[PDB]
């Protein structure tokens, strides 16, 4: 198991990456504001927190070299409305392209609501 | 219980855990909102920015601040910045931390009470308690005796405390701070050709500020030394790459404190208005309240005020005893740091407002506990 | 079924089926007639030439741009023009594939509303959308922040896109496209004594344009160069055999994008154009937009046009920042890849402006769901 | 002798003489220059056109407002436009005759300095004064006090002055006027496919804007009415014989002086902006400056425009007081007919600027004297 210490990063996002990848996602993931733009990982988590996901919204990681960043963006979206309606979180101001951008600060305050649930 | 510290001041937010010597969350108090209309698909269904995403976006945002003069206008914005400043820049629970919030004195009870029955009611914290501005920066600065003058982006007080005694009648509140200051700034910007009116320029504007406006300690011969020589030129760069130069409204805005006609305003210079609170106190107590003159807020960080605030403290002192001026380098935290310290007293642990106190009493209850 | 992207364009038509990486189907915007008697029985029957047959019997025919500056001038035109792309050139059945198709901006309402109400009543689509050309543009390029320069054969306009949000009062569109400079060289042509007044010669003195004509880097020393030297002389042969030889000339025409005055238009040019789109907008997204400068069009695609642009950018920038222009090589088919980005989304299926929404509303819907 | 009071403002250029109740001179403030080609000799002698001149060759001149907003760019054009007004349209000797001009508010100082030193050695006046153009207006209304809403073709600005006392902290400038309104009438003329692009075009717009636009009471029923029937289409004749005909665009264009979003521009109404301006005053004098409501300016000439106004301000009315607008016919000319009493005044003698205050006191004198 991964076990090493970036010559940048907190206690904090060390702890949301080791939950991640013990958690068993699918990719390996590394840095926290560079994985997760995709909001795959994301999905991944939600349906481990009992939040049902529908797949067939979901554009899989084979995408086109026309409207990639676009099907991403509509990923983000797609994961904000799981997350917002039926899975009942706190994301003022969050939007889909905070997640596509990176946004550390509103990654990290979905991450950790995330592991809350 | 990890109790939080929340300064949520008129212009910008302050918060953290009791027992931290700095806030961990400093972003300004405003909401934006798009003003433009957007063609493509799946990036509109943000409405609202909070945080720094509305600094960052304000080209295509208007930017409305919840809090005016440290009364709130607009109760449904800090809903959404209370939950930001909660879930996203402290990523905690309310229901697990007390939260101790601050307020300017003489401020009207309705905001008290519906600021209390707002965060009772929809983040469900144990327990509350609502301190004064003043008093908190005197806890940092480790005093039990003097007089504070908060100066932040609405509200300019004076709270003189005698061996922790405050004294209610001495107590005024002027509603001129920085954001007035601003104001004046883009008001006097228009005459080297510099025109500011979006809300977006408000911001260009309060960095012209905080990057060249100094206090004059004496105006007329800044005036006469801007007039006659260049060297109080200073240049500064839009965010486009167009370069601006005044050298006369550096101090022209700062002087507007001492001089509050320039925005029309009646009311007296700031440090006649602590003079007249000094005035107002025990004569006694007087020589202390001299001898502790404590500064804090944001409008306290213009170069010159300490040297300022001494000369005319001196010029209004009886001409026998001298005149001390505190200006702290944390002042514009020290709020925080005496809300902190307050919080983190083993003391202060029975005078928090629990919720059942609260649902015995309404949120009239926050009167008689604070 | 699946969306069709046509891009129905002044000069060009640019057809195919969403999802694709390039337009199917790609043929002049022109309508034949013949101008000529028949004298053999069995060749008379065809009264008009759509298609490329028009442009391989352009000798015996005349030629018509029926889509003139992005405007409708000839409906009947468009329709055989429509009728050809569906059944010949894409051989499919608008009736279940619903088509989405492009406008320039600061079009007249009227073209809108009759095109929708055509396409519906005479194609019987299930459903349709109306895209912005330089929208699609911005698709094709995957940016979300930028100011498209789209330049086609009849519409060069320019729209400032930051974070997604448009700035109409910052959208001005050019009336000068390829077809002006095709009519400019063929006024300056007269000059070596080549004369062409065919509609058909129009197309071979466009070809000529298309493959000698260059946009000038410095246009005053590539006079001297011309004028001194023989080295800018360059050859094109006509159908028929002669060839004919400009050095002058190739240059002098695409001047016209920088220098509307050739032609006796009061305009300014195509960078000043920006620049002033670029001024209108808010300065904090002022560097953004200069940082994404997007040109677009078969008339983007001369030599040497985006080292002028930057140039003259750079001339008329800060002085400070840097200006850089995305030329990618799809430029020509930039809207038609939008358009295919756009209807293949998903959540872009819920805009496609429904037949039982048009039924009801008219032809009025189009400008409320677009 | 007799005192020159000459109102220069953006559009038009108001001159006469001091004690008359209309001014002399009355033409556009444009400077037109030779577009085209003179092939045939013995016409081209004439490089400028400053007055109707260039108004009426301008299909083969290209015209230059030297005035933009109020803010003077171009100073060889008003120095062309003041020895035109001097010489030929009033034939009077300025180095006799006293120049009293006007000024908007929130005008930057170089503005004034370098217009009083052109003035003390162009023309080298004996004597001269700056005033205010909503004081003028009060002026001409022979009030003392209320509060003074001047829009005329560049600047829109609201001057509250009660007892002949003005407040300046309650002076704000807005730079929305009859050019504006113009931009926005053709921007949204190219629905009807009506375009318009030449400088000597904006001239056509300008009259079609001056004779068919109106102020709409309320702007939904006009929605309503305009898209349900015809009775609102107007017809105009094009100087060529063409005829257009607009229906909407009517009551859309003066819509955006209350809806400023029109041409995205975050400011807020006029009607507001009025009323921001009365209570950034003492509620004492409030009540006497809603009665008060003095407008003048050629943009102030929209039919329907005054009860639109008194109904916007009702609705901002605390509901309880009277409300009352005054709109003389003569607020095209108020500021001059103002300028003309003022200057008529035997009191007005001793403040004149006299050249020896200047020859002492370089250009800063007007700010002291003003
Ligand atoms: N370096 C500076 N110089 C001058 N003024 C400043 C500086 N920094 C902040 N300010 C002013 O103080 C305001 C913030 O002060 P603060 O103590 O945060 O007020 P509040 O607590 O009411 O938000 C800013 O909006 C600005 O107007
Ligand atoms: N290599 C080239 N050099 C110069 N001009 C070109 C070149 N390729 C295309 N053009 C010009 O660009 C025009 C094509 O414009 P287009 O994008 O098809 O307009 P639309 O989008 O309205 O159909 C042609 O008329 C042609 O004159
Ligand atoms: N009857 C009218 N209806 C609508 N607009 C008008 C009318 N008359 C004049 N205007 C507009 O008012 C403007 C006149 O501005 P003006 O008051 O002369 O400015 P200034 O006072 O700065 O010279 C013109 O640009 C014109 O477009
Ligand atoms: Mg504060
Ligand atoms: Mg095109
Ligand atoms: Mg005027």
Redesign the interface.
């Known amino acids: 198991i991964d076990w090493t210490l970036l010559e940048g990063e907190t206690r904090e996002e060390r702890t949301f990456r080791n939950w991640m990848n013990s958690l068993g996602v699918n990719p390996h993931v590394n840095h926290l504001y560079a994985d997760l733009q995709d909001a795959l990982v994301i999905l991944q988590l939600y349906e481990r927190i009992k939040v049902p996901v529908d797949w067939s919204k979901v554009n899989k990681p084979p995408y086109p070299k026309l409207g990639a960043n676009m099907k991403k963006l509509e990923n983000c979206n797609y994961a904000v409305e799981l997350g917002k309606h039926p899975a009942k979180f706190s994301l003022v101001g969050i939007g889909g392209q905070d997640l596509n951008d990176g946004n550390q600060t509103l990654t990290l305050a979905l991450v950790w609501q995330l592991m809350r649930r | 219980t990890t109790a939080l510290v929340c300064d949520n001041g008129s212009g910008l937010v302050k918060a953290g855990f009791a027992g931290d010597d700095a806030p961990r969350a400093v972003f300004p108090s405003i909401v934006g909102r ?13 409405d ?6 509305a600094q960052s ?4 945002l ?1 930017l409305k601040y919840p809090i005016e003069h440290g009364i709130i206008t607009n109760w449904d914005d800090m809903e ?1 910045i209370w ?2 400043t ?4 402290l ?1 905690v ?1 309310p229901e697990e931390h007390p939260t101790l919030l601050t307020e300017a004195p003489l401020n009207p009870k309705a905001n008290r009470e519906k600021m209390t029955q707002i965060m009772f009611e929809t983040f469900n914290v144990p327990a509350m308690y609502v301190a004064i501005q003043a008093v908190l920066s005197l806890y940092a600065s480790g005093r039990t005796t003097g007089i504070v003058l908060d100066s932040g982006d609405g509200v300019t007080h004076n709270v003189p405390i005698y061996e922790g005694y405050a004294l209610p009648h001495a107590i005024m509140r002027l509603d001129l701070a920085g954001r007035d200051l601003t104001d004046y700034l883009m ?1 006097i910007l ?4 510099y ?1 500011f ?5 408000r911001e ?1 504007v309060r960095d012209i500020k905080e990057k060249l406006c100094y206090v004059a300690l004496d105006f007329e011969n800044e005036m006469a030394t801007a007039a006659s020589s260049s060297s109080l030129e200073k240049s500064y ?7 601006i130069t005044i050298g006369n409204e550096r101090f022209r805005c700062p002087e507007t404190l001492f001089q509050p006609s320039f ?3 009646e009311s007296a210079g700031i440090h006649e208005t602590t003079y007249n609170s000094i005035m107002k106190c025990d004569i006694d107590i007087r020589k202390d309240l001299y001898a502790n003159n404590v500064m804090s807020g944001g409008t306290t960080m213009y170069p010159g005020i300490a040297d300022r605030m001494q000369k005319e403290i001196t010029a209004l002192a009886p001409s026998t005893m001298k005149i001390k001026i505190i200006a702290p380098p944390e002042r514009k935290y020290s709020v925080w740091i005496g809300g902190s310290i307050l919080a983190s007293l083993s003391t202060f642990q029975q005078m928090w407002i629990t919720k059942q106190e609260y649902d015995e009493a309404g949120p009239s209850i926050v009167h008689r506990k604070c």
């Open positions: 798009p003003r433009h209309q957007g063609v493509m698909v799946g990036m509109g269904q943000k609202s920015y909070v945080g720094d995403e976006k304000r080209g295509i208007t959404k939950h930001h909660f879930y996203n820049e990523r629970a008001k228009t005459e080297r050709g025109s009116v979006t809300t977006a320029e260009i760069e839009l965010p486009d790459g167009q370069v925005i029309g305003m």
